[PDB]
Design a protein around this motif. Sequence first.
Motif, short mmCIF file in Angstrom:
data_model
loop_
_atom_site.label_atom_id
_atom_site.label_comp_id
_atom_site.label_asym_id
_atom_site.label_seq_id
_atom_site.Cartn_x
_atom_site.Cartn_y
_atom_site.Cartn_z
N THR A 299 40.14 36.34 39.07
CA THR A 299 39.45 37.33 38.31
C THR A 299 38.11 36.50 38.04
N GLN A 300 37.70 35.44 38.11
CA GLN A 300 36.54 34.89 38.43
C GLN A 300 36.54 33.64 39.17
N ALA B 218 33.22 36.54 40.10
CA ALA B 218 33.17 37.60 40.88
C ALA B 218 33.04 37.47 42.31
N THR C 230 37.97 37.92 43.91
CA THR C 230 37.66 39.45 43.74
C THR C 230 36.89 40.02 44.86
N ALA D 117 47.37 39.04 43.84
CA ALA D 117 47.07 39.79 42.46
C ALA D 117 48.46 40.36 42.06
#
Length: 310
Positions: free
Chosen positions: A166-167, A169, A173, A227
């Motif tokens: 999640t980081q 971005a 991601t 994920a």
Amino acid sequence: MVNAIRTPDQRFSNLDQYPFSPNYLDDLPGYPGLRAHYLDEGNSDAEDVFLCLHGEPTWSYLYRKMIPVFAESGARVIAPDFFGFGKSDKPVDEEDYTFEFHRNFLLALIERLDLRNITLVVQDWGGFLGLTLPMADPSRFKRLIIMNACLMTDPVTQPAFSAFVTQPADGFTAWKYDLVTPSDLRLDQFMKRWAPTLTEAEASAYAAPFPDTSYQAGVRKFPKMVAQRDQACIDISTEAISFWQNDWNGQTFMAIGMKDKLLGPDVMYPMKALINGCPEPLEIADAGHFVQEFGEQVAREALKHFAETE
Ligand SMILES: [Cl-]
Ligand SMILES: [Cl-]
């Protein structure tokens, strides 16, 4: 048998610096109707075998700079293409691709070829999967070369192996967005972005396996599996942590692509600690996620490291 298609061989006619002859395994146990491609380079009777596992969205082409180095040292080199990738057959439904689908392929390949004295060579999904193999047949494995990779355990067990999802971005991601969103996914363009040192011809070699989107189900499923980790994946991956910490006693070499926004130092320093005997990493300042594009250095330095610890 699984619904699958085969890339026409002509797609591989024009390839930059891939002179390695094809080998195939048809109908491995658990894989009826499916043909897997692998490279088998160097002395077939060598004691040492470098098992070189690719990740997303690549194939054994990614190892083309490393293979000659390993072979010249007198070792055998095995570099398989996962189903969905390279010259291997390609299931057309994303649902047929799972963690264990890929893992059990590797186990079946090792058993079919009776590989022993293995130096496991991993990066990305080649590591997510490959790092879970030695505990299944520990006497076959002698050494590890680990590039940007980790284990797909749950976030509580190892937060570093989930935070990257999640980081930032512009890391995983962005990677996942690039892979799962386009209706017309162009892997040459993807690879030029994520491996900016590629030539045009090299980037085209990463598109070669995929005439159209129907050949890309395995490509689409991999980031979804990072994920969304099923319970089998989590459990196997957590068991592998224990293997590496408590059971592994082999020679180890780590190399980090320092520009990687996915699996750089944030993940690799935690992995170093978990692998018993893992030395300080070789940091490759200019290498990104696809560390094997700087792979001549990795291979040569790994061999030197193993010679001095023999
Ligand atoms: Cl690069
Ligand atoms: Cl992925």
